[PDB]
Design a binder for this molecule. Sequence first.
Ligand SMILES: [Mn+2]
Ligand SMILES: [Zn+2]
Length: 601
Amino acid sequence: MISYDNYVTILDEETLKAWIAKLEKAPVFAFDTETDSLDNISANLVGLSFAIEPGVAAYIPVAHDYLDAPDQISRERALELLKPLLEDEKALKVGQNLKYDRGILANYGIELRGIAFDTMLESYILNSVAGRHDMDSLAERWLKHKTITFEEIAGKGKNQLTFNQIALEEAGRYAAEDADVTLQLHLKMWPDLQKHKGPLNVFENIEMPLVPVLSRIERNGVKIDPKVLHNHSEELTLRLAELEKKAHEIAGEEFNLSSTKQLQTILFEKQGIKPLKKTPSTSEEVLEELALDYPLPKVILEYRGLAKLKSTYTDKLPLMINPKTGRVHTSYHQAVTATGRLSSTDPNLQNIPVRNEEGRRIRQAFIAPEDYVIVSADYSQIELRIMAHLSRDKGLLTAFAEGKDIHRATAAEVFGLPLETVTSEQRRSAKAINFGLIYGMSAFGLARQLNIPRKEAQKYMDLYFERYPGVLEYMERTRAQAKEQGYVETLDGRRLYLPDIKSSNGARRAAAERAAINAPMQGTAADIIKRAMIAVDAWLQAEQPRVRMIMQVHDELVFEVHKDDVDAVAKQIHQLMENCTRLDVPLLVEVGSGENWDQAH
Ligand SMILES: [Mn+2]
Ligand SMILES: [Zn+2]
């Protein structure tokens, strides 16, 4: 257990100033903040904690207000005395998920600098799939120590206490242990992160500098029109009713639009072929095949989709508007994906349909404030360009070199015919192949996405590998080093460990081979996107133009730019993105503007 003897609870200026003095000469120090809410923009700082050495840490309570709470240094006094240390780029800080802490200090006009080590990221860069990268998991993995959980001091359920209600000493045990343990994790991981210049590089120049930019992006938020969202909601209830009637009208009686229950008893009972279609799914969708001539399945198809979309974005989004800012603040996760791409939640921007008409309507609800315009900067098929370089293929490289459409160029060579005469079905085949390679798709999986028979798909892949030889070389060379060293790397050094590469199990090992081919191209794009964010954010902080970086989804960065500035700013973002990142991959940035995200997209 941790008692009230481990750490000190600072309740007077004389002691705080003493610690501040020690802090100023420590090589590095761990620091943490305690608040009354998980909501960064509207949380209140309840206290701060530090650790200058393993086992030597303190907690400074500034805003606990339960009945009869003892005197504490005022939040304002503590922050003014602590400010210089925090705003000093030279004083290096350590912390677990420093993003959250940086934002909290920003609620008080304090710019946290010297953001050098985030143990959450150290862990992530060491091995992304090693396990969960949260402090509690880390401490158990690297220190065989079980930390005090939040539920332990605050409680569970609706009657859970906010930090400001917890007794000073109990708050101290939790807060000071955080800092202390954080420092210990650093000391154990930092040394390891240097055994290789690859991960080291990614961690230092990509991941760490990104911590404050993600904070600024998250806090800026995104302006959403709730009216638009409400109309769309009402309209979708009418379309759901209409679609249900049409289904009943096609056959007879009433029924749910649920497969393997009410659908099979209708669809195949009135001709077709027995099996159902899982909502496994992106490989054999029985329902959309019948949709080319059959009407009923086509309506049930479009019904489910609308039903999912409505309750996921149409009814949720408006409830996520923050009362303090009036904007929506999405949560980006830096240490979650195995390849290094940022993920997103509440809302998960990446699941909003792109090639679909309704997803477009959702995007229209993302609006620019008065006198501003939404500006969308996107990397045109970056992954494919990355594969081009990785395979050293003159064909692909030349296609991008002279600005031709790679999918048509691919079909022109694979099917052997002029580029101006390649048909829509041929381009669609090549595209299926091109993206099939990135995910390491099997010759039969391609047959299921193209609807052609097996070995007909094989015919195509053999023609591809012959016309584009370098792509097979890469596929094999990557599957090679993967088994040899148990991992694959990206252009910047980022690593994905594949433990099941020699699995001895069939499919488990196949997954590991697909990931081998994929990870290098996907992780490299991720790295590129992060370098663009840092680059654009640096210019933002230095030049102070009238623009905010509001979103990051897939291979694009979304901004809010002042209408009078649109042109000069567009020139700038474009240059920053296709020039201040890597100079070895042939990159292209498509920049567009509009009144809402859909208009600029
Ligand atoms: Mn914390
Ligand atoms: Zn804490």
